Structure formats: structure tokens, C-alpha cells
Design a protein around this ligand. Structure first.
Ligand code: X7B
Ligand code: CL
Ligand code: CL
Ligand code: CL
Lengths: 98, 99
């Protein structure tokens, strides 16, 4: 698809068996609100406007992003918005065009 | 151009005659720049980021060039970790996401 930027670029994702998430070229990584995921994890600190939060880093997680499957690392914690970052945007072939 | 996302989508911007590096950020509603001098009056704005809500200075109708594309619009000044070009200016330059 081609997504304009008049509004937040929100899409439906499927992760761990549905959520709304922001397609975010400004995020290196994907950050999802509190949920359970299978497998091992390790703690991580991530930061930006307003400071840092603690998240759990799960590796090799499959996500369906607007119908496109991708696998990669997902961070879980108290983010105010679910964010799809570059680590998964690349896998669905997303580009910014102007 | 067509910008892939294997690296951070950093560009050069020009604002107040000076070149700066900034990140093209589809996850930002607003353009936020590190502390600098801009002309005119400003208004208060609260924005909510990953770590919580903060106060910034809102300057309207600011001339800014982004990767060579001329824009004129709202620029927020405050403690941001990197300069971010948000959707208010990405729309001015005609940017879309494509997959
Ligand atoms: C700041 C930027 C360089 C980085 N971020 C993405 C940015 O797109 C956020 C995404 C976001 C959107 C809504 C709410 C919270 C966060 N947008 C934002 O702050 O936008 C502001 C400006 O406009 C306003 O509208 C929206 C909020 C206001 S991040 O989330 O802080 C972030 C994401 C991933 C990682 C890290 C930090 C890190 O350290 O490691 B990491 O794992 O790679
Ligand atoms: Cl990854
Ligand atoms: Cl590619
Ligand atoms: Cl604007």
C-alpha cells in the first residue's frame, strides 16, 4: 500500500495470537504494550522524549504487520503506543518516498 | 528519493541559515528540534513521548529546508534526544510510506 501521513500511520498487527500499532521510521526497534510472549527474554532500557522505560526483550518473534509476516526482536513494556520500528519495517519492504 | 530503513533515515535540514542533522520520523506527530534561537513569539505545548509528557516551545510558520525540500511550518524546541521531522512537515514535502 501507499500510506499518507495526514494522520498517524496505524495498522493492525497480529502478535502472540490483534493490536493496533504505529509504523514508525523514527524507532530502531519494535515496542509493544504489556503482553505475554513465549520463550526467553532479557531486560533492556529504552529512552526518548520524556526519558527511559524498562522493557523485556524477546528475540525471534513472528508478527503479521498489515498482512505481511516478519520475524525479529520485540520489546515489551509500558509504552504509550504500540510501535513497529525499523527492525521489522525493513522485513516487509517498507520505504519512505518523496 | 526512496529511502530504505536498514539505517536510520537521517537527512540534513537547514533552519535559521544553519545545517543540522534530523531523523525522518513517521511516528512523530510534530517536528521537535534541539535548543536553538528562532524568531517571533512562541506558545506552550505538551507532548507525550516514550518516557512521559514534557513541555516544549512552539514556533509557527518557520522556514525550514528538509533534504533540499522547502517547507514552512511549526517547529517545537525542547529536550529531544535527536532532531525529529514529524508528520506536520513530512506531509509538506510529500512523503508517504510504501510497502
Ligand atoms: C524520539 C525518537 C528518536 C525515538 N522514538 C520513536 C518516535 O517515533 C516516538 C514514537 C512514540 C509515539 C507516540 C508516543 C510515544 C512514542 N515518537 C515521538 O516521540 O514523537 C513526539 C514527537 O511528536 C509527538 O507525537 C508522538 C509523540 C510526540 S522512541 O519511541 O522514543 C524509541 C523507540 C524505540 C527505541 C528507542 C526509543 C530506544 O532508545 O531504543 B529503541 O528500542 O530502539
Ligand atoms: Cl530484529
Ligand atoms: Cl530492501
Ligand atoms: Cl505545520
Amino acid at each position: 500500500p501507499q500510506i499518507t501521513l495526514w494522520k498517524r500511520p496505524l495498522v493492525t498487527i497480529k502478535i502472540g495470537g490483534l493490536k493496533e500499532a504505529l509504523l514508525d521510521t523514527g524507532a530502531d526497534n519494535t515496542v509493544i504494550e504489556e503482553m505475554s510472549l513465549p520463550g526467553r527474554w532479557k531486560p533492556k532500557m529504552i529512552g526518548g522524549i520524556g526519558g527511559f522505560i524498562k522493557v523485556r526483550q524477546y528475540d525471534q518473534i513472528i508478527i503479521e504487520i498489515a498482512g505481511h509476516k516478519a520475524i525479529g526482536t520485540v520489546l515489551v513494556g509500558p509504552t504509550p503506543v504500540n510501535i513497529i520500528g525499523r527492525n521489522l519495517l525493513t522485513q516487509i519492504g517498507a520505504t519512505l518516498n518523496f
